[PDB]
Amino acid sequence: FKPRNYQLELALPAMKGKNTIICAPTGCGKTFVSLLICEHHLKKFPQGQKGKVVFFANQIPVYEQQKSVFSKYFERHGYRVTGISGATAENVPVEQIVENNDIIILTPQILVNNLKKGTIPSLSIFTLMIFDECHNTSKQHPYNMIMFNYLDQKLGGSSGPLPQVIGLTASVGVGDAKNTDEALDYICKLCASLDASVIATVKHNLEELEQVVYKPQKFFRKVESRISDKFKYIIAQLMRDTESLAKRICKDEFGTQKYEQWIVTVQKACMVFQMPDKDEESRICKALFLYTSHLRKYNDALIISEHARMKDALDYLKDFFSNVRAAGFDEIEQDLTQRFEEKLQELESVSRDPSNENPKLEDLCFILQEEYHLNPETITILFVKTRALVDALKNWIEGNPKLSFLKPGILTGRGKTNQNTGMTLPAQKCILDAFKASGDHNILIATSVADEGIDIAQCNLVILYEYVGNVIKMIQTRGRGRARGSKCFLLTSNAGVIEKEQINMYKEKMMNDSILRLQTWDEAVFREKILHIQTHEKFIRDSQPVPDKENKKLLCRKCKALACYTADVRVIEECHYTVLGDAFKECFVSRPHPKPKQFSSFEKRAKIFCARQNCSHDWGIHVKYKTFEIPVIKIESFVVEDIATGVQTLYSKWKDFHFEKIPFDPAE
Amino acid sequence: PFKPRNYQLELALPAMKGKNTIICAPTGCGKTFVSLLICEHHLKKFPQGQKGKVVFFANQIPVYEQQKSVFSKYFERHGYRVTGISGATAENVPVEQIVENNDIIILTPQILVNNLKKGTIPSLSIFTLMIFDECHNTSKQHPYNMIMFNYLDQKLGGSSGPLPQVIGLTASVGVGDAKNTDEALDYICKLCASLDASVIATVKHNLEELEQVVYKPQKFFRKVESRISDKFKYIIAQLMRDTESLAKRICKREFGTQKYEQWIVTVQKACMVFQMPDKDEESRICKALFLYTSHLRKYNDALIISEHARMKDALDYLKDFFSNVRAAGFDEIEQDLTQRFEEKLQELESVSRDPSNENPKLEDLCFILQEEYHLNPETITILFVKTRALVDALKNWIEGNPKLSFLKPGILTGRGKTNQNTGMTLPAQKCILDAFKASGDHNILIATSVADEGIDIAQCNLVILYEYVGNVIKMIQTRGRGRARGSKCFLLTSNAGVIEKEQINMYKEKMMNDSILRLQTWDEAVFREKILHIQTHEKFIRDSQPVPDKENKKLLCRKCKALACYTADVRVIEECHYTVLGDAFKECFVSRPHPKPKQFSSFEKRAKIFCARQNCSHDWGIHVKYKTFEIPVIKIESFVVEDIATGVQTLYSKWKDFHFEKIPFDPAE
Amino acid sequence: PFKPRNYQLELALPAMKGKNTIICAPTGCGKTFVSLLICEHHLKKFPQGQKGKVVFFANQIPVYEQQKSVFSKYFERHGYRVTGISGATAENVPVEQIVENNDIIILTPQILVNNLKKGTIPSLSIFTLMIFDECHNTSKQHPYNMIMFNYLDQKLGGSSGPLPQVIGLTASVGVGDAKNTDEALDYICKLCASLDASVIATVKHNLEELEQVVYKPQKFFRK
Amino acid sequence: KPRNYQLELALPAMKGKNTIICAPTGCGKTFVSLLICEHHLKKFPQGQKGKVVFFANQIPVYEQQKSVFSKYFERHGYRVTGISGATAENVPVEQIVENNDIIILTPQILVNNLKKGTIPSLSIFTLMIFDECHNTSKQHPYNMIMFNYLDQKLGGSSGPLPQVIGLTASVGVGDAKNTDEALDYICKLCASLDASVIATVKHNLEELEQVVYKPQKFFRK
RNA sequence: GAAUAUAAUAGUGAUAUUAUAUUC
RNA sequence: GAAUAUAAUAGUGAUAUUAUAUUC
RNA sequence: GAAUAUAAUAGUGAUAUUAUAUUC
RNA sequence: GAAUAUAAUAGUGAUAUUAUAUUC
Ligand SMILES: [Mg+2]
Ligand SMILES: [Mg+2]
Numbered sequence A: 001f002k003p004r005n006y007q008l009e010l011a012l013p014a015m016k017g018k019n020t021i022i023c024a025p026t027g028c029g030k031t032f033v034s035l036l037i038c039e040h041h042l043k044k045f046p047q048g049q050k051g052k053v054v055f056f057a058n059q060i061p062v063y064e065q066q067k068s069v070f071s072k073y074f075e076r077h078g079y080r081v082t083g084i085s086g087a088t089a090e091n092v093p094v095e096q097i098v099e100n101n102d103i104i105i106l107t108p109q110i111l112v113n114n115l116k117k118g119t120i121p122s123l124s125i126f127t128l129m130i131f132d133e134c135h136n137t138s139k140q141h142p143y144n145m146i147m148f149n150y151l152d153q154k155l156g157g158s159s160g161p162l163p164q165v166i167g168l169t170a171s172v173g174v175g176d177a178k179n180t181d182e183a184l185d186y187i188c189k190l191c192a193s194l195d196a197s198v199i200a201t202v203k204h205n206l207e208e209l210e211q212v213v214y215k216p217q218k219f220f221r222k223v224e225s226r227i228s229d230k231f232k233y234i235i236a237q238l239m240r241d242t243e244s245l246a247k248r249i250c251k252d253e254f255g256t257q258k259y260e261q262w263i264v265t266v267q268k269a270c271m272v273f274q275m276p277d278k279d280e281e282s283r284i285c286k287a288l289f290l291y292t293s294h295l296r297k298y299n300d301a302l303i304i305s306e307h308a309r310m311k312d313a314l315d316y317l318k319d320f321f322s323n324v325r326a327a328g329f330d331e332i333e334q335d336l337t338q339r340f341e342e343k344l345q346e347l348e349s350v351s352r353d354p355s356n357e358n359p360k361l362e363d364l365c366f367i368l369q370e371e372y373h374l375n376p377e378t379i380t381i382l383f384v385k386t387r388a389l390v391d392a393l394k395n396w397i398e399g400n401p402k403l404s405f406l407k408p409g410i411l412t413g414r415g416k417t418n419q420n421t422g423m424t425l426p427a428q429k430c431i432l433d434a435f436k437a438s439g440d441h442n443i444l445i446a447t448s449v450a451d452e453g454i455d456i457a458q459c460n461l462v463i464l465y466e467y468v469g470n471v472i473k474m475i476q477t478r479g480r481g482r483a484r485g486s487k488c489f490l491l492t493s494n495a496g497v498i499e500k501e502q503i504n505m506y507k508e509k510m511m512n513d514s515i516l517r518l519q520t521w522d523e524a525v526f527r528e529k530i531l532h533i534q535t536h537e538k539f540i541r542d543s544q545p546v547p548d549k550e551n552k553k554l555l556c557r558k559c560k561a562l563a564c565y566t567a568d569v570r571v572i573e574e575c576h577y578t579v580l581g582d583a584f585k586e587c588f589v590s591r592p593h594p595k596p597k598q599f600s601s602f603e604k605r606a607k608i609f610c611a612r613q614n615c616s617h618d619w620g621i622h623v624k625y626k627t628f629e630i631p632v633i634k635i636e637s638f639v640v641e642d643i644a645t646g647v648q649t650l651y652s653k654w655k656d657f658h659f660e661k662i663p664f665d666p667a668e
Numbered sequence B: 001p002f003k004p005r006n007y008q009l010e011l012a013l014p015a016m017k018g019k020n021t022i023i024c025a026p027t028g029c030g031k032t033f034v035s036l037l038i039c040e041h042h043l044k045k046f047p048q049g050q051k052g053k054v055v056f057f058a059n060q061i062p063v064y065e066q067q068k069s070v071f072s073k074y075f076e077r078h079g080y081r082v083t084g085i086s087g088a089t090a091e092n093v094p095v096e097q098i099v100e101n102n103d104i105i106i107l108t109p110q111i112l113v114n115n116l117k118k119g120t121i122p123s124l125s126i127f128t129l130m131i132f133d134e135c136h137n138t139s140k141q142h143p144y145n146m147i148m149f150n151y152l153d154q155k156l157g158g159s160s161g162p163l164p165q166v167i168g169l170t171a172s173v174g175v176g177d178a179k180n181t182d183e184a185l186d187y188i189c190k191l192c193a194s195l196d197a198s199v200i201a202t203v204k205h206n207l208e209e210l211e212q213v214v215y216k217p218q219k220f221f222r223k224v225e226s227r228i229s230d231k232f233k234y235i236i237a238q239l240m241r242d243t244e245s246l247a248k249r250i251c252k253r254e255f256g257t258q259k260y261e262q263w264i265v266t267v268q269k270a271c272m273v274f275q276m277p278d279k280d281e282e283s284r285i286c287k288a289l290f291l292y293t294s295h296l297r298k299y300n301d302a303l304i305i306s307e308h309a310r311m312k313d314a315l316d317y318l319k320d321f322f323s324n325v326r327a328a329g330f331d332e333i334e335q336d337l338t339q340r341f342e343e344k345l346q347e348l349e350s351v352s353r354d355p356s357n358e359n360p361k362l363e364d365l366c367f368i369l370q371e372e373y374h375l376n377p378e379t380i381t382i383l384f385v386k387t388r389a390l391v392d393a394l395k396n397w398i399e400g401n402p403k404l405s406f407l408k409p410g411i412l413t414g415r416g417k418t419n420q421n422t423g424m425t426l427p428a429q430k431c432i433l434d435a436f437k438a439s440g441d442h443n444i445l446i447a448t449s450v451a452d453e454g455i456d457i458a459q460c461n462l463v464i465l466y467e468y469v470g471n472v473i474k475m476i477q478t479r480g481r482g483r484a485r486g487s488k489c490f491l492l493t494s495n496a497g498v499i500e501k502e503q504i505n506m507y508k509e510k511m512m513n514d515s516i517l518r519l520q521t522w523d524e525a526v527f528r529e530k531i532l533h534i535q536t537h538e539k540f541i542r543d544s545q546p547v548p549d550k551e552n553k554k555l556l557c558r559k560c561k562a563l564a565c566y567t568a569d570v571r572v573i574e575e576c577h578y579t580v581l582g583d584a585f586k587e588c589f590v591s592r593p594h595p596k597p598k599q600f601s602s603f604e605k606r607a608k609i610f611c612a613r614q615n616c617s618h619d620w621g622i623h624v625k626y627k628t629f630e631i632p633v634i635k636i637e638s639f640v641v642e643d644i645a646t647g648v649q650t651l652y653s654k655w656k657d658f659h660f661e662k663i664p665f666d667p668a669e
Numbered sequence C: 001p002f003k004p005r006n007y008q009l010e011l012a013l014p015a016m017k018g019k020n021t022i023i024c025a026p027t028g029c030g031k032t033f034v035s036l037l038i039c040e041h042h043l044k045k046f047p048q049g050q051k052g053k054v055v056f057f058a059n060q061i062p063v064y065e066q067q068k069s070v071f072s073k074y075f076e077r078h079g080y081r082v083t084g085i086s087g088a089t090a091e092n093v094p095v096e097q098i099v100e101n102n103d104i105i106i107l108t109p110q111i112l113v114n115n116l117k118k119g120t121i122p123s124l125s126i127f128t129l130m131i132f133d134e135c136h137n138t139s140k141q142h143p144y145n146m147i148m149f150n151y152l153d154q155k156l157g158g159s160s161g162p163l164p165q166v167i168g169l170t171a172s173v174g175v176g177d178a179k180n181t182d183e184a185l186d187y188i189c190k191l192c193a194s195l196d197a198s199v200i201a202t203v204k205h206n207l208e209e210l211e212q213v214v215y216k217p218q219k220f221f222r223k
Numbered sequence D: 001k002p003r004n005y006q007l008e009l010a011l012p013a014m015k016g017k018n019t020i021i022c023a024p025t026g027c028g029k030t031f032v033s034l035l036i037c038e039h040h041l042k043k044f045p046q047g048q049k050g051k052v053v054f055f056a057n058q059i060p061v062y063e064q065q066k067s068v069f070s071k072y073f074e075r076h077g078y079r080v081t082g083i084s085g086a087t088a089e090n091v092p093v094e095q096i097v098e099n100n101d102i103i104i105l106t107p108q109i110l111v112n113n114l115k116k117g118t119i120p121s122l123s124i125f126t127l128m129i130f131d132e133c134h135n136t137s138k139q140h141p142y143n144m145i146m147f148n149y150l151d152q153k154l155g156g157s158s159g160p161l162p163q164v165i166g167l168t169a170s171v172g173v174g175d176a177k178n179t180d181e182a183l184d185y186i187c188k189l190c191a192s193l194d195a196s197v198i199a200t201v202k203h204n205l206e207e208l209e210q211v212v213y214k215p216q217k218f219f220r221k
Numbered sequence E, F, G, H: 001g002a003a004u005a006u007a008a009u010a011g012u013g014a015u016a017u018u019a020u021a022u023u024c
């Protein structure tokens, strides 16, 4: 490919050896910039010397794409291109792989793990590091850890050579800056995190860039909420029927986030309820658990109903009560299900009438109608907040006759690794490769994509349905509609959303201004300030509990049944936790895992659940670890109890559970 | 080395002359040393440049290991490489080479059967001497008889190549269902034919030497009466009638008998195939009837236990059952039944605690034990019962009885079913057996049954048969427990059929011995001719001896009528096992870690699998590791077979009776 | 991803059963997917404590890059490291370590010939599966035939240690300068001998499918 | 019924380290050997398997060990065999070694077969266990075996060598007069057996001293 | 720079020439 | 099984809850 | 998962049900 | 028949002599 002038311009600082953050609009072709930089870098070395490049991609699709492109491009020049990801990280000589290759495409976590281990003793082995989406170089992100190693070597007494650092992004961000000064502060701190001394932006070829990447016209749609409230009435006193039921077992604004927070707190507060009679403790705790769960589901249904059809909420509840059954018979579940089934008729009567419609859905329908009437070849992408809303709007589109021209597809994340939700990568690739002008799909409903990602079919219509984001996501989303005439519609019923998007635009202004101001500084002075920030951050980073050796009991959070003792618990690789003994084997049932993956030295085989009287509470998974077939449990599934005092404590994460952790040993 | 008793030499004499022989002698007279004698002579008879190859068959792991140890320690100093092969060490090993490079090999016969069938061992000609421990088992479709089918097929065929001498060790050749001497003689001739034996070796010239080493225990018959007052049975009967009324209310023979059990089993099976247009209701109803019939069965078992033991034993059986009904998730109907049992529970336990409502049989047993241990506190007792439930019950009764404080009861049972959390493991058996002695922890040993003689244990001067019915073979074998002088054996029962059956067995022993004496007077040539005649007949008969339904069938859960899978998904491994393909089946079942993880064939048990729909948890089969794969293995006895076209539902106990298009398992799929 | 057509499974079947096989099928019937099937089954057949190592032979840089890309994208998910060595990336690199630290290696045959000749690769036993694209070139002094000369020398010679399974891919085995059936059979048998092939796989049970996928063009003669 | 000090003595061996286990006579070396062998054999994945060889230099010890090992490992599905001078000749030794997981052996057998070539390498074994390893010195068969081992090790060969376990109650100190000479001697012994760890009872001395008591020695001049 | 393959034309053939393509 | 980021909601904040996405 | 034997109980028997035990 | 170890006794030692024990 022949380079566009702004690409040569953006690449020029990097090719001069400067640690650079390259900031240019999404879709301007950062890949060829990376190729230019890498080619020049590798070819610049004399005969007796050789360079080594490492490219960081934080997503498997980007990883494979870049691996393929770099492989095809640099093979003929004589440079060996390889790649390492989680799938191919185990039981391979990472050091030899890195050594015997010139360009290594890498998921940052691999490098973090191998740096921590010692297989890669130093970053001095590399001569060039390139961070895709370098704005992620912050906090406890893998990029930032790698750079912690880098800077610890730099500022330290280590005289070993460090690699040139290049970052790629479309937006460096400004954090929560309120003015240009704070913005410049933040950007300087990012440049410090990446040890960058130059911020590369297009200047002398803006006219060329603006004829390749066009900024889509944004529109703000503030509509009215549901004036009606009959469905909410029904579900509300259903909710205080359930709340009265829960209140009639022990002592002590629906459809909102505060209520969800509160009911989560209530469930977690009921989990620690104790009694002299442990069996009645079990019964009461299971009761409260069920009630709180139902309340939560009702609340979720209300939220769905406010953002979509009442039918969608009713089908959500229907699916929920459908999965309550086929799990087992519970007296209380039968009670609640009856209490719902008696009002189902009124609910569907209310969800059938056409006088019942969300003005938001009608406005969205109006927008789609107008746009597709003006242009039937329109390719739309519709962002929502939740997958429930994804399915809901898909069903709403496919149901509405006025949207007959639409061919709705779906685009969600991969969901939680140990649950039967989300969407697999090849499925994503399938729908995406179907989502084209002359394809099977016209409109694509989606939640959120990590940064820019792979280029999909160009969407001349983007719709943000109750969707807020930061300035980085705002700037990145523009890549969906690079063609001139592309439109974006922020549809919502909250002034908050609009105001925050406006705030984001102003933040973009602050960002560009701060960058342009920084680009005027003397590079030496900037390097001095960078060194200052780095030294300060290293001082802070190098800042300053006793394990309770008393035995503890692990009870089921749902039914308070004894799972095991902490004395039986062993820790693998300082992160995972397994149980020993034949006793624990009698305490759980298991189902084959819906997403069998080979993370670390583990291979997921099954999920494990509580066995006592069909409790079925998720305790963790069952895996193949080397030679052993062992269970691995999560602490957030159990209530900790002290033997002596009898205290009951909850922990969402193992690292917060400071007990005596005995290392797993094969010789036991 | 050792001092051979003269009768042992007499028994070994025909075998040392190279004649195919069935050695029949009292249990515990020292068959191991006879085996060592015959084997040693056989190996030492060969000249230079040629060697012999002995194989020793034992159909029990303990006897296998014992004989392996004895033969190794005895013979290898002589320069004969001794080895053995069992199921544990049979997989992924060159059996042909192992047999070839060893002089004495100890097998469980199924190994040789499988290797003969597979062709790895091309012929039995590789062996020069075959010894069958407990040779009386050489009948019907027993592995011994399979091996001998191979042997006789090669013999009666035009096949050349030499055949090994055949020795068979037993204490009783048996007489089958004989009524007189001639029938018994025909049976014994048939057994001799099955083993190609032309000689029956017994002790004759050294009887007085034998009768001072092995004494016959005196037998007594204890006929008692059943309990006269049984309010327990009345209450349980009322519960049964109520359960029957519920069962009849959902869909439209004295209690505590085997007939009612057969009936309720037939009824459960008949209810598993109840059809309705509404399938959810069909599921609910079938599950209902299954639960009802199950509870009726448990009540029946309880009545039987109460009949043979304490009321507390039956009540604890029921309590354990209803306890297992809990922790497995209550059904509405299970809740109803548990409530109905709970209301009567107080009255039941009240009647149970009443000392006046005691079983006369336990009183008489206690009397016998009391008298015998009074006369001799150092008494070593063994107590045989029919069921394991009765084992546990009687141990609890002994430990609970103040009158029998001098007893320290131990337990001995089988290894139970391979895929159930029951029975008793082999090292546990060993543990309890080595603790059973005079200077040990256990005074009396409560046991179910033991295949043949088995490993010799601590001699028992008291053997009690508590409602115990067996054949003449095991009757003669049981005498080996009390070989010492003055050993006593009681037969306690409340039904004359048992005592009469024992008398029948004794008469059968008389017929057996008399028939042996008669046969021993025959000329060996004539006997060999008759043997060849019977062999040829049986071989003709043996040599003399359906379309597969290609229609797709639904395999449904016998408890829920829930769709488990289709026969199209089913694949067959090694023509015996049956797995299921597809990720759809994976959501139909749950699993629990296997209680007895063993490695049969190329299969390694990891877990048992159960139905997943609405907490049914009906047993579907197991989950194993097979070579590279991790797959489920199902049993047809857990499912109903519905034809998709006709809708007709059918039941099959075994896969071999289910004649459908069985597609072989292929890794390339 | 896609889904295998029946005749592709039919063509792949002898290879998946471990037989040394020459797959002969019309151009464009989809040989890359057959290769992927064979490789996937082969690699997934090994137990835990073992692993396979496949080598693919393309004698053209475009085909080399294509197969490298496809195999990389395909097997990366399954946890098999895919690499390649062409003439441009063969010098001053540890060939033995590259072959050792990879499960699938796409290769120009001359690389393997030269590395066998130098001794950097002491034996073909390091591979468990060799695939020859356009296997009809395995004759005379072609690099394929050199590799197979090494193979056969290890086979027949006192040399032992396991030899890799051998797959060949073509649309036509050729008949050389044959004038009749017997001579053609002679030639084909000699090619099978050159490739140590015991099975020639063609489409038979799914001809209708293949014919619906691949049509024979009508030929006209213009004098 | 494992004792704690037995587990302590077996622990370094179970971690794959070449180990000389030094513990008083009669503390139960057989069970330690059984634990080591069992763990070692079970550690291998599906596609692999181990092969243990146990050296006893006397026929009674040979028979005893062969018996105990055969009785113990039969249930675990491991084929146990033995070869001595009484059954050494006219029998395929390599085939026996190949077709068994545990081979009880008098060292002269292995010396003879190694020198004769029927056993081409010690790589066939994954674990070697020398009973009374203090005899691994001078021109003793143990030392010849270990000479083969070390010749293969220090050689250019890349073939995998087996783990090495020595068993004894006393490593000896030779003619050492001071701690330095004794240290050198013991180090040399460890080098002869390629051992990097000497396992002794440290944390369970009470238990051991309750199982084995030191008799009182009187001098009668 | 070197190697390889196919085709046509010469030679009984080995092989040679050119064209074409591939590879290191 | 674990780790990470973003957003919303609580809190002065450390942080916490949920949602979303990512990675080993 | 499968195979085998014994006993009781139904059937003329094949066989079937349960119990018990054994083996691969 | 051969090989090996330990102890004592001679020799600076290699080693030798005897006793004892082991192995092929
Ligand atoms: Mg929701
Ligand atoms: Mg060409």
Ligand SMILES: [Mg+2]
Pocket: B449, B450, B451, G006, G020, G021
């Ligand atoms: Mg029996």
Ligand SMILES: [Zn+2]
Pocket: A556, A557, A558, A559, A560, A561, A610, A611, A612, A615, A616, A617
């Ligand atoms: Zn629970």
Ligand SMILES: [Zn+2]
Pocket: B557, B558, B559, B560, B561, B562, B611, B612, B613, B616, B617, B618
């Ligand atoms: Zn079921």
